[PDB]
């Protein structure tokens, strides 16, 4: 919030910015928004299966 005086009275400036969640970085914050549940999806599971016991 900043005042700026001109030839006729003062004006008031107000700036608000939202920081874009820098993870592990410092351009925004860490610790994302509370209502931000996020799900990961894996793979490499195969349905073709035959009971083979391979040794090592």
């Amino acid at each position: 919030v900043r005042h700026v005086l001109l030839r006729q009275g003062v004006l008031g400036i107000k700036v608000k910015i939202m920081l874009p969640w820098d993870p592990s970085g410092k351009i925004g914050p860490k610790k994302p928004l509370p209502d931000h549940v996020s799900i990961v999806e894996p793979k490499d599971e195969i349905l073709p299966t035959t009971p083979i016991s391979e040794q090592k």
């Binding site: 349905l47 299966t49 035959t50 009971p51 083979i52 016991s53 391979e54 040794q55 090592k56």
Partner: protein, 313 residues
């Protein structure tokens, strides 16, 4: 004809019954771990008006007790709970002698050596851990281990060269040389996670089950896969026999007991059949244990009850 009969029922718990363990030394004392954080040691009064009374409640644990096992002499018990800690009790007073700290997630299984010299524990960290009997970390299987929850770990009973075996949530049964703690062989199959694992008293077979509903028999000597039994609904705990060639399986509401000779079901232990007026009608079955006499089996359910089943002729 060999048949099973409901002898009696034991009461005294407050949540699910998760494990039951008997020792061949004292044929009149039972251990029952439950979800009420306590471990009940029973006064097995063999009468028929009741069948047993809790003798002493081993207390002190901050969450569910997932596994318990009795020592070979009957003076100690080992326990593993859902706060990551293991506890070594004294069956005479209580007074946990040693807590085995070191884990980041819940402790699922626990097992005791043949001479009660090493300890093994599997957890949700995908870590198998070996311990000295004094409460220190001997060895950790960090990688080449399961990629998911290590649901159960067991020792082989053999004095001939030693195996430990572990099943996990990565649908794999992995087997280890106990001296070296490296892999011996893999075992693939079992579409779905794995709930249990067990070794026959002759130390030659591993009967593994899980979500799939099929119990698979693996050979500890040949390194192969013998055969499969479709257990029907789902497998919670598989236990071999002390003086027979059977295999007791805990299905959802029932217990399926196979004669392995011709691989045929002997019985279907179903409890009472009230018309449950909605939804899942029956209280499911969690654990089961064969008595060293080979005469009666104990079964722990999800409705706070422990039921007895006697072999009758």
């Amino acid at each position: 004809t060999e048949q099973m009969t409901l002898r009696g029922t034991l009461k005294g718990h407050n949540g699910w019954v998760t494990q039951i363990a008997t020792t061949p030394q004292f044929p009149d004392m039972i251990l029952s771990a439950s979800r009420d954080k306590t471990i009940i040691m029973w006064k097995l009064t063999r009468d028929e008006t009741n069948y047993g009374i809790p003798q002493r409640a081993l207390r002190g644990h901050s969450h569910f007790v997932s596994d318990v096992v009795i020592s070979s002499d009957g003076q100690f018990a080992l326990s593993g709970s859902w706060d990551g800690t293991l506890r070594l009790w004294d069956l005479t007073t209580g007074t946990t002698t040693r807590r085995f700290v070191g884990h980041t997630k819940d402790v699922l299984s626990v097992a005791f050596s043949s001479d009660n010299r090493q300890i093994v524990s599997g957890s949700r960290d995908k870590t198998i851990k070996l311990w000295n009997t004094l409460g220190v970390c001997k060895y950790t299987v960090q990688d080449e281990s399961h990629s998911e929850w290590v649901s159960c770990v067991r020792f082989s009973p053999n004095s001939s060269n030693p195996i430990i075996v572990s099943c996990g949530w990565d649908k794999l049964v992995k087997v280890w040389n106990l001296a070296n703690c490296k892999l011996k062989t893999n075992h693939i199959g079992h579409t779905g996670y794995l709930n249990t694992v067990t070794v026959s008293p002759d130390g030659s077979l591993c009967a593994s089950g899980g979500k799939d509903g099929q119990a698979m028999l693996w050979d500890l000597n040949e390194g192969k896969h013998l055969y499969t039994l479709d257990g029907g609904d789902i497998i919670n705990a598989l236990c071999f026999s002390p003086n027979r060639y059977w295999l007791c399986a805990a299905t959802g509401p029932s217990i399926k007991i196979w004669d392995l000779e011709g691989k045929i079901i002997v019985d279907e232990l179903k409890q009472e059949v009230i018309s449950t007026s909605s939804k899942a009608e029956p209280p499911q079955c969690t654990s089961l244990a064969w008595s060293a006499d080979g005469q009666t089996l104990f079964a722990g359910y999800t409705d706070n009850l422990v039921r007895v089943w006697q072999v009758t002729i």
